[PDB]
Amino acid sequence: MKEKEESIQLHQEAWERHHLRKELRSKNQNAPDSRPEENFFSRLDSSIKKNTAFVKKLKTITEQQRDSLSHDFNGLNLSKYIAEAVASIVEAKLKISDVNCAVHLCSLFHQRYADFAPSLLQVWKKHFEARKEEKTPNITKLRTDLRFIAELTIVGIFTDKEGLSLIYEQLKNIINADRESHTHVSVVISFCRHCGDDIAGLVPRKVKSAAEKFNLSFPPSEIISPEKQQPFQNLLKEYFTSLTKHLKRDHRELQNTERQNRRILHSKGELSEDRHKQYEEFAMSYQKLLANSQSLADLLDENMPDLP
């Protein structure tokens, strides 16, 4: 059966995700007591050429460079180039599939250099400053960014205070940004999909359903405490509420414009004018808003409102 194989996959990914996070968080939180010393740094090379080259490569971090960038990293003394390396990392445009590599590299930095985490945090904050008054949203980057700062917290590079606080901040903006126009929906879904388990305490309907139906035991939430998760869950439901309002409105005004085309069908006979390419745009984005609403109701384990 197809349904069982998908559930086994979900279940397998869940555990891979969980085991990795647990392993990385342990190393990162334990980093301070065993960073290397002066003498060790002496034997790595501080050349400006190589360290600068490396900082540049960090602008295009890619999964298939995991080993190559790691190899270079281990030979360089990056003591003086933290701020620059942090800047490359924050600006770099990562695909969904590249974020784990970036986090891996961030962990090698963090585990070697005390200056890394404070710089990374500080530069992320500035970066969300620059965004707030620059106009034309760049949602593609904010999507990944949110996931990225999420992992960096889960993985213990940022402390709960620093990282949770930073994520809460950026989520608030999305909630406030998206009350009529729900333009960041895919950003909230991605965040939920990837990090909602540990940051928001999410347990989606699919996971619940798979667990009961196939007697699969899914990973426990053990990273962020339920108290710290609650605020995040509240925001998501409140967003979801807002999104369901916007779904109802657009249902009415789709069918108040279908049941208006019935008057303009009878009276003065049809004419598939520009209205026959305006309905093809109202019902395009509705279909996508319905898809995203279903997608997020599941992640949050909420029912969909009923659509006559």
Curated annotation (Swiss-Prot):
It comes from the Eukaryota. Found in a post-splicing messenger ribonucleoprotein (mRNP) complex. Associates with the exon junction complex (EJC). Interacts with SMG1, EST1A, UPF1, UPF3A, UPF3B, EIF4A1 and EIF1. The chain holds residues 121 to 428 of 1272 of the full protein. Residues 250-269 are annotated as: Disordered. It is found in: Cytoplasm, Perinuclear region; Cytoplasm. This is Regulator of nonsense transcripts 2. Residues 48-308 form the MIF4G domain. It comes from Homo sapiens. The gene is UPF2. Involved in nonsense-mediated decay (NMD) of mRNAs containing premature stop codons by associating with the nuclear exon junction complex (EJC). Recruited by UPF3B associated with the EJC core at the cytoplasmic side of the nuclear envelope and the subsequent formation of an UPF1-UPF2-UPF3 surveillance complex (including UPF1 bound to release factors at the stalled ribosome) is believed to activate NMD. In cooperation with UPF3B stimulates both ATPase and RNA helicase activities of UPF1. Binds spliced mRNA. Ubiquitous.
